[PDB]
Amino acid sequence: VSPPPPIADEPLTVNTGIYLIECYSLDDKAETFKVNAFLSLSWKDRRLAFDPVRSGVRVKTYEPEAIWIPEIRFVNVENARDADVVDISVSPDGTVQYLERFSARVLSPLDFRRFPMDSQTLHIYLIVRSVDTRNIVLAVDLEKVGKNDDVFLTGWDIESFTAVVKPANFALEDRLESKLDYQLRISRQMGYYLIQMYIPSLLIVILSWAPARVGLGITTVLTMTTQSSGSRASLPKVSYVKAIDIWMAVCLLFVFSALLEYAAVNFVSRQSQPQRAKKIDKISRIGFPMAFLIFNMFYWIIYF
Amino acid sequence: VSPPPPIADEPLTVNTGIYLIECYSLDDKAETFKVNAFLSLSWKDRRLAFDPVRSGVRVKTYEPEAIWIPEIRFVNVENARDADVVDISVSPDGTVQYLERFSARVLSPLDFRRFPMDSQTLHIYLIVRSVDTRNIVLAVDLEKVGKNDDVFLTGWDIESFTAVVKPANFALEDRLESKLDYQLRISRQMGYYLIQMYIPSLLIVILSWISFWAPARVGLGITTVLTMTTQSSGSRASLPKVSYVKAIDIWMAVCLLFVFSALLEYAAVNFVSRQSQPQRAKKIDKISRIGFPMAFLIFNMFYWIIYF
Amino acid sequence: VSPPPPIADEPLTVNTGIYLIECYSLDDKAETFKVNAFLSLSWKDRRLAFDPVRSGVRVKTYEPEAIWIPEIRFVNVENARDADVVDISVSPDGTVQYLERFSARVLSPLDFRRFPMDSQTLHIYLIVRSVDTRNIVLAVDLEKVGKNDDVFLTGWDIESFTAVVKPANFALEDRLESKLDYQLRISRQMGYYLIQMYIPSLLIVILSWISFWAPARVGLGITTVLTMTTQSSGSRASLPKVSYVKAIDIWMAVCLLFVFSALLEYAAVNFVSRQSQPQRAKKIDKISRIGFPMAFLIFNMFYWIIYF
Amino acid sequence: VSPPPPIADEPLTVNTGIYLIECYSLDDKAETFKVNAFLSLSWKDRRLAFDPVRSGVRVKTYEPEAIWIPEIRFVNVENARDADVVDISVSPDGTVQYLERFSARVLSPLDFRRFPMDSQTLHIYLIVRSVDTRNIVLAVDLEKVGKNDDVFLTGWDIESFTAVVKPANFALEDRLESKLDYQLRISRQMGYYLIQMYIPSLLIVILSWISFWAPARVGLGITTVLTMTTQSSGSRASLPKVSYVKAIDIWMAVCLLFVFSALLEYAAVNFVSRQSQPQRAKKIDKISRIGFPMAFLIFNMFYWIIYF
Amino acid sequence: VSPPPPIADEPLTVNTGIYLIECYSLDDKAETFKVNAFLSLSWKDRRLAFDPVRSGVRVKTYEPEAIWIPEIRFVNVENARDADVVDISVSPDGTVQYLERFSARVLSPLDFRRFPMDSQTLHIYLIVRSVDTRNIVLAVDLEKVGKNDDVFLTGWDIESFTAVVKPANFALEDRLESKLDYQLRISRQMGYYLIQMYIPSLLIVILSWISFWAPARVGLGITTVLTMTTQSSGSRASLPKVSYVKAIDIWMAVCLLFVFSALLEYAAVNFVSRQSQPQRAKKIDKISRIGFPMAFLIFNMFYWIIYF
Ligand SMILES: [Cl-]
Ligand SMILES: [Cl-]
Ligand SMILES: [Cl-]
Ligand SMILES: [Cl-]
Ligand SMILES: [Cl-]
Ligand SMILES: [Cl-]
Ligand code: NI
Ligand code: NI
Ligand code: NI
Ligand code: NI
Ligand code: NI
Ligand code: NI
């Protein structure tokens, strides 16, 4: 089989559509998500045109091997999609309607800067390579883009599944490549964070505020690294900094500066000066909660 | 091959059945379970009808490629089911009886609100897409729905495996689609929870409460926090972190306040008696010692009222 | 191809055998084990009979597609076995001798009640479904059941690999099914447990009692709780959490009560050495110091009587 | 099919190119990375040559089975690449242009000596075995070597993707083998290390010294060891344990000596003042309080000079 | 296809060779290693013999399906090898030369008794089952056994890759089986251990002795058990739990007795001086402070004599 010949010179337009059936396994660490969807393709092949009056049939159904089908690939997939052809239908004018159900593991980067109050745009890039006979270009059939109502991504709210209607046409290894960007929009159900993560990690910090203070103020450090290890499956370590990987470098400083204060107050009163000891070791007791609110509100202004 | 032609205009009814052979790997985190079952399909294809007297046989056996077979798919599966055709039998009137043994990883959401005293309804959705030649509809053959007696799901009690007999017929991308809902009902085996998880998490906070009867309050208070997060680390494989709140997500969130209010009490009592007032020190440190166990069950009993 | 026709009415007997080549990955948590074995099958197909005088040869070798072969399946497997046909030999009477080497992931429940001093019977269930032409029944050829001497299952002693010679014949979805039970008996090599798990779990309970002899009782008594959960989660990969109770899930829950009742004492003795009651303080704090090693000895021996 | 015959004697030159589409899963522990790329191959096959005028076509497209294609393999791959042929184009002189999109798991050793300030050269080795008919040699078509702009490797900066243009030709099992070295060069994003890994672990060493200013020094000095190993376990997923020594494996090793020599000082100063000598006690306990931060900076700067 | 007929009665000799291309994933817990190698096979098939002057060709290349090829299998593999035929060459006398590149997950037991100063012999067992027509025996072609210079096994030193030249011929299920033993010899790069595991594991229970010089000894001696069990969990990925005992599984079990006997001495010295006897208190508390490092030195040297 060879591609449909052009009537003039025009490129062959392959109309596309993705209908999400399932979305699952959004792996934050691997920056992948699995998808199970319908992929619909439409193109005109005049060599397949027929007379409806003489044939008596409105539509003809073909086997994938019997006709020419465009080689559509996904850009950002780990391995090639697992695809099962559902249907191939040809109208009398020769317009082919292709439908396959596929599953794929998609590579899509995630921006964790605003975690756990972040929103993401997951991408599914469709691509086609041109043949020497003719150029193949991709288009979006908005009637065939969508999602099942039951599509659930645990811990996320699904907002929209849209496609950037204009393909990105470019040359790659001396041939044309037509790329479409399908985008799935999500937002984190951060409701849970306060209850289990935000509040109890803080009730360790808050519990951090003379030789007995050495056993007291150092525990709220040993337990902070245990809340960390005890819930690290929900804390992200990025190559850059997050508004939470910063709330982390602040708790580490705040747990230190508190034990710098209680290491200076219990050493100033012992080095013959107990007058100025109650001057800084009472002011830091109202200074810390306000130095914190100011700092966390200063951090918040930048990132979120 | 092409679908069987309609005698009038009627859609083709494909009778279905799922017989569970094995149920395994209920992954709470991934919200998946693996299934190994028989899938039975029945439909009328008049083009295959024969006379038993002339043929000499009462049944005819075909190879899947030799005849038309409906494209049945599962909705909520990770990848397509691994299927092996067991048998294809045709009766004299053209009634096809199809049987395959398949294995599949099923996506089925779990409600953890009542964990570990929860019950779930796992779903297996069967679906068929209609052809331009004719409309295909699914039906349940209750005689071919069931489960092996040996079907075991470790940590769960299997109640029932039934099917919603009425399919959900709907249009999708300009074609009819027929969807059936097979439901496997399961309740949890919560017996174990108290023994190793529920009771020992309490025997740390009761050991925070047996120090309200001081500098010793630090070594008894600040420890039954460090050890609570260590049972919470040491038994996290049994504790679920959901996007919402569970009756256990809260039953552990009350512990975070109770371990704090306990060290707010012992941070106010050991600071009031030191600031020249040891009279009112024994007034709050002694009532909080009988106040905490009653504030607790009142709270845990208040939580229990809403979730259960 | 179609099944061999019956001479009278009698079902077709398919003689079976499993020869274990490798046993590996006994996953206690998943309750699976992987197997690599030979599967031998024998049945009489008179249509394949030949004269050794005329054909010259005493045996005919066939390709799987060339002849009829019974569809033999495993019941308790996650997915279908990865099989490679080694040989198909047809003898003059028409007796077919089939041999394949397969590998499979087997689902076999494990009883952890006596862990780590437990023994198990792993099962491999062979099954065949009868066809419309005739009924198929399975049999055990004891000459073709066995295991390689090198078959090793790390951490276990392999006792025997036998088959229940009588198949379980039953009806399933309007057809006959013939099921054979192959059993691999294995026992646990518990020698290691004392050295790395049992003894140090105890040198923390023992070191909690070596402090029942006052402000130092706070630092000791509570540490041998924080360290107990560290030996636990520090070696949890060797401790099983079942839906039911084990003599080890019980051994580890008595420690939770003994670490608590040990800090019910260190809290009463600290309340008695104060609150103007010094006398009766040395009456219970000294008696509990000889009471518990024996209250423990009695309890663990009482537990042992029930389970093992 | 057979290889193209040589016009004189010359080996068949197969021009190669790898264009990276995706790079992912750089597994530091397994020393693997996954790749998804285009593989382009070009060679002259005169038997496929044609006249463009007489044929009416300027290019001829073939199916992989229709023509001879060189068996190109990757040396350092776990299993064989998953490949999908995109295009096969033949020009009038019979120059074949082959293009496939493949995915592969690549084995490439990583040097962790300078972690987290390390740079790596990941390799992809292309290889071809010669046939008896003729010798096949590999070449680099620099026009077909490259990477997509979007190629991202999380936690790494991608420097260059080049190929060593000269193949390594050698004999292996009585035939010639031609090997090309494709090098994807990378470097880390060490900015993050200070914030979350380097500084908090250092704050523990710093807070161990903020106690060199007597029985309370035992409870304070030993905690910043218990917490040191908790920062370690708490962030071990970012700390590498190699078969050799890393400047960080040494930086972690210096902390083990500095946390010991710190509690050797606080075990000698709190024992000298108690053994009737409190004069010389303030001589070493005060000098070590300004000695440690400078003995550390000197040591870490001495270590740094060697490795990085 | 059928096997080559014997000229007299002699068994067919299949000459073998394995050339290692890659060695990776030595999984200590699973007792597996992955291999990627060439497998070469040679046997005489007279039916394929040809005249060199008449044919014009000195070698004839065949497709695997075109000729008879011996079914060679690996004994100790999880699943069957992933194999890709590279070349099949026939010499005029009818000597076939077969070459395939395969990848396989090999089951090979590991002896951890001397860990981390252990050496291992990994095995790859090649096997052939004889056919009814004739007996097939395996041989080693030492010219075709070897390994690539780049073959690296992370954390191990590769010593040699040799084959036991004499096959183990035996009967299995009424047929002859010919088994060859290929051995890859490796040793552990134990240099790492001192740095990260060896010296720091000690410094914890070395720091338990730096407190045998009284009420502070309660707080210091007991957190040592808390930190040791954190150094252990903190580096458990490098400590092996075997069904048997090691020079390490004991080295870590002596520490459990030494961390206890340490707190038995402090549970006796800090209780004897308090129970009106402070004379004999300085007699045993000072002697145990020089007794422990020598009782340890002796014990570790006594242990060493047995195992290594
Ligand atoms: Cl794809
Ligand atoms: Cl499916
Ligand atoms: Cl079979
Ligand atoms: Cl099977
Ligand atoms: Cl082979
Ligand atoms: Cl194999
Ligand atoms: Ni498929
Ligand atoms: Ni299958
Ligand atoms: Ni196979
Ligand atoms: Ni190739
Ligand atoms: Ni492919
Ligand atoms: Ni292959």
Which of 42-61 (D) contact A at CB < 8 A?
A: 58-59, 61
Indicate the SS3 state at residue A260: helix
Contacts of D86 (CB under 8 A, 6+ apart): A71, A129, D38, D99, D100, D101
The residue whose two tokens read 């055998």 is C17
DSSP letters for A3-21: PPPPSSS-PEEEEEEEEEE
Contact between E253 and C195 using a beta-carbon 8 Å cutoff: yes
Residue B295 at interface with chain A, using a CB cutoff of 8 Å: no
C-alpha distances in angstroms, C27 versus C33, C46, C185, C240, D22? 6, 45, 16, 12, 35
Q: How far from the centroid of its chain's Cα atoms is residue E252's Cα?
A: 22
Closest CA to C139 of C6, C33, C44, C35: C44
Contact between B249 and A215 using a beta-carbon 8 Å cutoff: no
Closest CA to A97 of A55, A148, A58: A58
Helices (H) and strands (E) in chain C, counts: 11, 11
Q: Which residue type is seen at D287?
A: I
CATH for C193-308? 1.20.58.390
d(CA B209, CA D21): 61
Ligand nearest to the CA of A105: 1
Which of 122-181 (B) contact C at CB < 8 A?
A: 144, 152, 154-156
E230-256: burial string, b at 16+ Cβ within 10 Å, e else: bbbbbbeeebbbbbebbbbbbbbbbbb
d(CA E146, CA E141): 11
Quick one: CA dihedral B38, B39, B40, B46, positive or negative? negative
* Experimentally determined by: X-ray
Closest CA to C201 of C236, C158, C245: C236
Residue D290 at interface with chain E, using a CB cutoff of 8 Å: no
Of C200, C204, C238, the CB nearest to E241: C238
Indicate the SS3 state at residue D252: helix
Residue of C nearest to B20 (CA): C75
Closest CA to A82 of A128, A36, A42, A41: A36
d(CA E230, CA E236): 9
What are the sequence ranges of the domains in chain C?
Answer: 1-192, 193-308
Ligand nearest to the CA of E81: 6
* DSSP state letter for D78: S
Return the structure tokens found at C292: 């518990």
Quick one: CA dihedral C108, C114, C119, C121, positive or negative? negative
d(CA B237, CA C141): 45
Of D25, D38, D220, the CB nearest to A218: D220
| Mutation to test the B interface, candidates A40, A61, A101, A207, most B Cβ within 10 Å | A207
CATH for A193-304? 1.20.58.390
Indicate the SS3 state at residue E221: helix
d(CA D202, CA D259): 11
Size of interface A-D (CB pairs under 8 A): 122
* DSSP state letter for E76: S
Q: Is E25 left (phi over 0), alpha (psi -120 to 50) or beta?
A: left
Q: Is B151 left (phi over 0), alpha (psi -120 to 50) or beta?
A: beta
Give, as residue ranges, everything with CB less than 5 Å from ion ligand 7.
Answer: A 84
Residue C116 at interface with chain E, using a CB cutoff of 8 Å: no
Contacts of C189 (CB under 8 A, 6+ apart): C155, C156, C157, E243, E244
| Mutation to test the A interface, candidates B208, B217, B225, B251, most A Cβ within 10 Å | B225
> Would you say D146 and D39 are in contact if contact means Cβ atoms under 8 Å apart?
no
Q: How many other C-beta atoms lie within 10 A of the C-beta of residue D244? A: 13
Contacts of A279 (CB under 8 A, 6+ apart): none
Return the structure tokens found at B254: 């009350």
Count, residues in chain C: 308
The helix (H) or strand (E) run that includes residue D41 is strand D32-44
Quick one: CA dihedral E46, E48, E51, E57, positive or negative? negative
End-to-end alpha carbon distance in chain D: 55
d(CA C111, CA D107): 41
d(CA C190, CA E241): 12
* DSSP state letter for D143: G
Indicate the SS3 state at residue E139: strand
Closest CA to A109 of A176, A222, A30: A30
Closest CA to B41 of B17, B65, B19: B17
The helix (H) or strand (E) run that includes residue D299 is helix D288-306
Indicate the SS3 state at residue D203: helix
Span from the CA of E84 to the centroid of ligand 12 (angstroms): 5
Return the structure tokens found at D225: 């060891």
Query: Rounded to a whole number, what is the distance in Å from the CA of C227 to chain E's nearest CA?
Result: 5
d(CA D192, CA D194): 6
Indicate the SS3 state at residue D228: helix
Spatial strand order in the sheet of E119-129: E72-74, E119-129, E176-188, E156-171
Size of interface A-B (CB pairs under 8 A): 112
> Which residue numbers come right before each break in chain C (C to N over 2.5 Å)?
213
> Would you say A181 and A125 are in contact if contact means Cβ atoms under 8 Å apart?
yes
Contact between E206 and D31 using a beta-carbon 8 Å cutoff: no
Indicate the SS3 state at residue E106: strand
Q: How many other C-beta atoms lie within 10 A of the C-beta of residue B213? A: 15
Of B103, B195, B204, the CB nearest to C253: B195
Quick one: CA dihedral E138, E140, E146, E151, positive or negative? positive
Residue A1 at interface with chain D, using a CB cutoff of 8 Å: no
Quick one: CA dihedral D59, D61, D67, D68, positive or negative? positive
Contact between A82 and B80 using a beta-carbon 8 Å cutoff: yes
d(CA C156, CA C187): 5
The residue whose two tokens read 């595991």 is E197
C-alpha distances in angstroms, C153 versus A296, C33, E30? 56, 10, 11
Quick one: CA dihedral C143, C148, C149, C155, positive or negative? negative
| Mutation to test the E interface, candidates C145, C196, C213, C286, most E Cβ within 10 Å | C196
Using an 8 Å CB-CB cutoff, list chain E residues near C40: 173
β strands within chain B, DSSP E: 12-27, 32-44, 60-61, 72-74, 82-90, 95-107, 119-129, 136-140, 146-147, 156-171, 176-188
Residue of E nearest to C200 (CA): E256
Query: Rounded to a whole number, what is the distance in Å from the CA of A34 to chain B's nearest CA?
Result: 8
d(CA A170, CA D150): 14
d(CA C121, CA C115): 14
Residue B189 at interface with chain A, using a CB cutoff of 8 Å: no
Query: Rounded to a whole number, what is the distance in Å from the CA of C175 to chain E's nearest CA?
Result: 33
Residue E261 at interface with chain C, using a CB cutoff of 8 Å: no
Q: What is the dihedral of CA E128, E133, E139, E145, to 10 degrees?
A: -60
Query: Rounded to a whole number, what is the distance in Å from the CA of C210 to chain B's nearest CA?
Result: 18
Using an 8 Å CB-CB cutoff, list chain B residues near A230: 229-230, 232-233, 236
> Would you say D139 and D167 are in contact if contact means Cβ atoms under 8 Å apart?
yes
Indicate the SS3 state at residue B106: strand
Residue E25 at interface with chain D, using a CB cutoff of 8 Å: yes
Helix runs in chain A, H state only: 52-55, 191-193, 199-205, 213-217, 219-222, 224-230, 247-256, 258-268, 277-280, 284-302
Return the structure tokens found at C232: 């636990």
The helix (H) or strand (E) run that includes residue C55 is helix C52-55
Integer Rg of chain C from CA: 30
Of E103, E148, E191, the CB nearest to D79: E103
Closest CA to D142 of D103, D180, D89, D93: D180
d(CA B162, CA E145): 60
The residue whose two tokens read 């204009």 is A166
The helix (H) or strand (E) run that includes residue A215 is helix A213-217
C-alpha distances in angstroms, A141 versus A16, A104, A182? 6, 21, 12
User: How big is the CA angle at B154 (ends B149 and B156), to the nearest 5 degrees?
Assistant: 80
d(CA C232, CA C240): 11
Return the structure tokens found at D179: 């090997």
Query: Rounded to a whole number, what is the distance in Å from the CA of E296 to chain C's nearest CA?
Result: 18
C-alpha distances in angstroms, A38 versus A84, A148, A156, E213? 10, 11, 22, 76
Ligand nearest to the CA of D103: 11
d(CA D174, CA D135): 12
Closest CA to B254 of B292, B289, B308, B286: B292
β strands within A144-222, DSSP E: 146-147, 156-171, 176-188
Q: How far from the centroid of its chain's Cα atoms is residue E78's Cα?
A: 16
Residue C62 phi/psi, 5° resolution?
Answer: -120, 160
Of D99, D155, D230, the CB nearest to A226: D230
d(CA B225, CA B258): 10
> Would you say E123 and E97 are in contact if contact means Cβ atoms under 8 Å apart?
no
> Would you say B205 and B259 are in contact if contact means Cβ atoms under 8 Å apart?
yes
> Would you say A254 and A220 are in contact if contact means Cβ atoms under 8 Å apart?
no
A18-36: burial string, b at 16+ Cβ within 10 Å, e else: bbbbbbbbbeeeebbbbbb
d(CA D181, CA E147): 19
DSSP letters for C78-127: SS--EEEEEEEEE-TT-EEEEEEEEEEEEE-----TTTTS-EEEEEEEEE
**CATH class of residue range E1-192:** mainly beta
Residue C59 phi/psi, 5° resolution?
Answer: -145, 150
Return the structure tokens found at D253: 């090793």
With 0-12 / 13-18 / 19 or more C-beta atoms within 10 angstroms meaning exposed / middle / buried, residue D290 is: exposed
Contact between A19 and B245 using a beta-carbon 8 Å cutoff: no
Indicate the SS3 state at residue E229: helix
Of B219, B229, B252, the CB nearest to A227: B229
Return the structure tokens found at E205: 């229970």
The residue whose two tokens read 């739990």 is E241
Q: Which residue type is seen at C158?
A: I
Ligand nearest to the CA of B82: 8
Contact between E229 and C227 using a beta-carbon 8 Å cutoff: yes
Size of interface C-E (CB pairs under 8 A): 128
Helix runs in D42-198, H state only: 52-55, 191-193
C150-167: burial string, b at 16+ Cβ within 10 Å, e else: ebbbbbbebeebbbeeeb
> Would you say A205 and A248 are in contact if contact means Cβ atoms under 8 Å apart?
no
Of B172, B230, B243, the CB nearest to A226: B230
Give, as residue ranges, everything with CB less than 5 Å from ion ligand 8.
Answer: B 84
Contact between A19 and B256 using a beta-carbon 8 Å cutoff: no
Indicate the SS3 state at residue A78: coil
The residue whose two tokens read 């292996």 is D172
Residue of A nearest to B265 (CA): A207
Indicate the SS3 state at residue D282: helix
Ligand nearest to the CA of B100: 8
Using an 8 Å CB-CB cutoff, list chain C residues near E72: none
Residue A252 at interface with chain D, using a CB cutoff of 8 Å: yes
The strand pairing partners of E87, in sequence order, are: E99
Query: Largest Cα–Cα distance of chain C, in whole Å?
Result: 113
> Would you say D158 and D23 are in contact if contact means Cβ atoms under 8 Å apart?
yes
End-to-end alpha carbon distance in chain B: 56
Q: What is the resolution of this structure in A?
A: 3.5
Return the structure tokens found at C239: 């401790």
Indicate the SS3 state at residue B197: helix
d(CA E97, CA E59): 10
> Would you say C39 and C163 are in contact if contact means Cβ atoms under 8 Å apart?
no
Residue A80 at interface with chain D, using a CB cutoff of 8 Å: yes
Q: How far from the centroid of its chain's Cα atoms is residue C133's Cα?
A: 39
Count, residues in chain A: 304
> Would you say B134 and B45 are in contact if contact means Cβ atoms under 8 Å apart?
no
Of A79, A174, A211, the CB nearest to D216: A211
Helix runs in chain B, H state only: 52-55, 191-193, 199-209, 218-221, 223-226, 228-234, 253-260, 262-272, 281-284, 288-307
